[PDB]
Amino acid sequence: VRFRPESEIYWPISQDSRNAMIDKLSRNTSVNFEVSLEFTRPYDPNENAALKHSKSWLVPISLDMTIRAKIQSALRGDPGHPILIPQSIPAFIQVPNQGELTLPTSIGNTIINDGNPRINTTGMEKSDEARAWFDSLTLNLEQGKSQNEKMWIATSEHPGDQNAKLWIKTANTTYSGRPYLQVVGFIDRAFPS
Amino acid sequence: VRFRPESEIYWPISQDSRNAMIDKLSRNTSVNFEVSLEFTRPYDPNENA
Amino acid sequence: SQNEKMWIATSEHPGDQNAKLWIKTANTTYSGRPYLQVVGFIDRAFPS
Amino acid sequence: FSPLLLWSLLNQIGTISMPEKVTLRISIEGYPPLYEMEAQGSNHDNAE
Amino acid sequence: FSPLLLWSLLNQIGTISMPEKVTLRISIEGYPPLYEMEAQGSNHDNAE
């Protein structure tokens, strides 16, 4: 599955929703990131309705003041500010017969251990243990001539060592020249009675 | 539950949808207001959705 | 301009205000307007 | 009295988690909404 | 052994078709999405 790096629609935010986001960033509360993935099946006239499979990941924002200030500047519309979300999207995913998307854990052990082992020595909790082999997302706001035109571009970075021969190479677009975001899915179709 | 008084997005109306609303108001037909409230629960893996 | 068009909501309590049956609202930390409030009674003990 | 005990242990009323997402919309019927708002949160600490 | 044969023929695990529509969204919680993208196609030939 290849997604275009640019956004399909412009950002439909109001000034008062954006001001609220910046003000919440100013304090010391807990703000979160969110990545959502969805798969939709055909009609299936035997049981009607299209089966949908969803899963979302929440990545806490660092409590350090400098990172939050950088995020505030990025949302305000400053030129160079790559919002960074570490360990957000999985490169490999599993699509079951019904339910929520599941992570490939067998390949996770191979990637985290073999190659160049990364951290996994600071007594990391079980919440981030199953997320150590994920990719990272960087986001930029190209804006445009006016405030009405505001679009975001995404870009991914492979964990550990790049060009590790475990990665399927990406495309490069036939109109803009930017890489395509890639996800590999393992569809399960042999369903039960 | 506390909602912000302002709106999260701008009004995405077209001139022809707005003109239709005003014209329907001009006559003596029946127009209605509408208020909708929604609550969403977690995934609940026992029964999904 | 016409591209920027937003609506603001505001609520009014029925009957007598400050009737001690109302939970007081907040007042916003960025604009100063009251927050719309709803109190919910969630039911979780579901059956078999 | 074994079926009665089996049934009593098998009923076992359960519980479900509290909502995290609440939405509100105000509109004139048959047209795009005039107002819409969102109130997310799982820590149950923010004012929203 | 007729009930066993009936059950074995009646189980008959089935198959379902592959997805055609995939969506992705990136957002800060409680706000309109910052990015959203679509990947449609049924011929399984386009690069998307």
UniProtKB/Swiss-Prot annotation, chain A:
Function in brief: Pore-forming subunit of a mechanosensitive non-specific cation channel. Generates currents characterized by a linear current-voltage relationship. Plays a role in reproduction by positively regulating inter-tissue signaling to promote oocyte maturation, ovulation and fertilization, and sperm navigation from and to the spermatheca. May play a role in regulating cytosolic and endoplasmic reticulum calcium ion release.
Family of the protein in this entry: Belongs to the PIEZO (TC 1.A.75) family.
General remark: Piezo comes from the Greek 'piesi' meaning pressure.
Compartmental location: Cell membrane
Portion of the full sequence shown: 2154 to 2346 of 2442
Name listed for the protein in its UniProt record: Piezo-type mechanosensitive ion channel component 1
UniProt tissue specificity: Expressed in the pharyngeal-intestinal and spermathecal-uterine valves and in multiple reproductive tissues including the germline, somatic oviduct, and spermatheca. During reproduction, it is expressed in sheath cells, sperm, both spermathecal valves and the spermathecal bag cells.
Domain of life: Eukaryota
Topological domains, Cytoplasmic: 1-193
Curated annotation (Swiss-Prot), chain B:
Outcome of gene disruption: Reduced brood size due to defects in ovulation with incomplete constriction of the sheath cells impairing oocyte transit, an accumulation of ooplasm in the uterus as a result of 'crushed' oocytes, caused by incomplete opening of the spermathecal-uterine valve, which in wild-type allows the fertilized oocyte to be expelled into the uterus, and sperm navigation defects.
Source domain of life: Eukaryota
Tissue: Expressed in the pharyngeal-intestinal and spermathecal-uterine valves and in multiple reproductive tissues including the germline, somatic oviduct, and spermatheca. During reproduction, it is expressed in sheath cells, sperm, both spermathecal valves and the spermathecal bag cells.
Cell compartment(s), UniProt: Cell membrane
Record function comment: Pore-forming subunit of a mechanosensitive non-specific cation channel. Generates currents characterized by a linear current-voltage relationship. Plays a role in reproduction by positively regulating inter-tissue signaling to promote oocyte maturation, ovulation and fertilization, and sperm navigation from and to the spermatheca. May play a role in regulating cytosolic and endoplasmic reticulum calcium ion release.
Family membership noted in the UniProt record: Belongs to the PIEZO (TC 1.A.75) family.
Note: Piezo comes from the Greek 'piesi' meaning pressure.
Annotated protein name in UniProt: Piezo-type mechanosensitive ion channel component 1
Upper classification of the organism: Eukaryota, Metazoa, Ecdysozoa, Nematoda, Chromadorea
Section of the entire sequence shown: 2154 to 2202 of 2442
From Swiss-Prot, chain C:
Taxonomic superkingdom: Eukaryota
Tissue expression from the record: Expressed in the pharyngeal-intestinal and spermathecal-uterine valves and in multiple reproductive tissues including the germline, somatic oviduct, and spermatheca. During reproduction, it is expressed in sheath cells, sperm, both spermathecal valves and the spermathecal bag cells.
Localization per record: Cell membrane
Gene deletion effect: Reduced brood size due to defects in ovulation with incomplete constriction of the sheath cells impairing oocyte transit, an accumulation of ooplasm in the uterus as a result of 'crushed' oocytes, caused by incomplete opening of the spermathecal-uterine valve, which in wild-type allows the fertilized oocyte to be expelled into the uterus, and sperm navigation defects.
Function: Pore-forming subunit of a mechanosensitive non-specific cation channel. Generates currents characterized by a linear current-voltage relationship. Plays a role in reproduction by positively regulating inter-tissue signaling to promote oocyte maturation, ovulation and fertilization, and sperm navigation from and to the spermatheca. May play a role in regulating cytosolic and endoplasmic reticulum calcium ion release.
Family the entry assigns: Belongs to the PIEZO (TC 1.A.75) family.
Miscellaneous notes: Piezo comes from the Greek 'piesi' meaning pressure.
Name of the protein described by the UniProt record: Piezo-type mechanosensitive ion channel component 1
Species whose genome carries this gene: Caenorhabditis elegans
Covered range of the whole protein: 2299 to 2346 of 2442
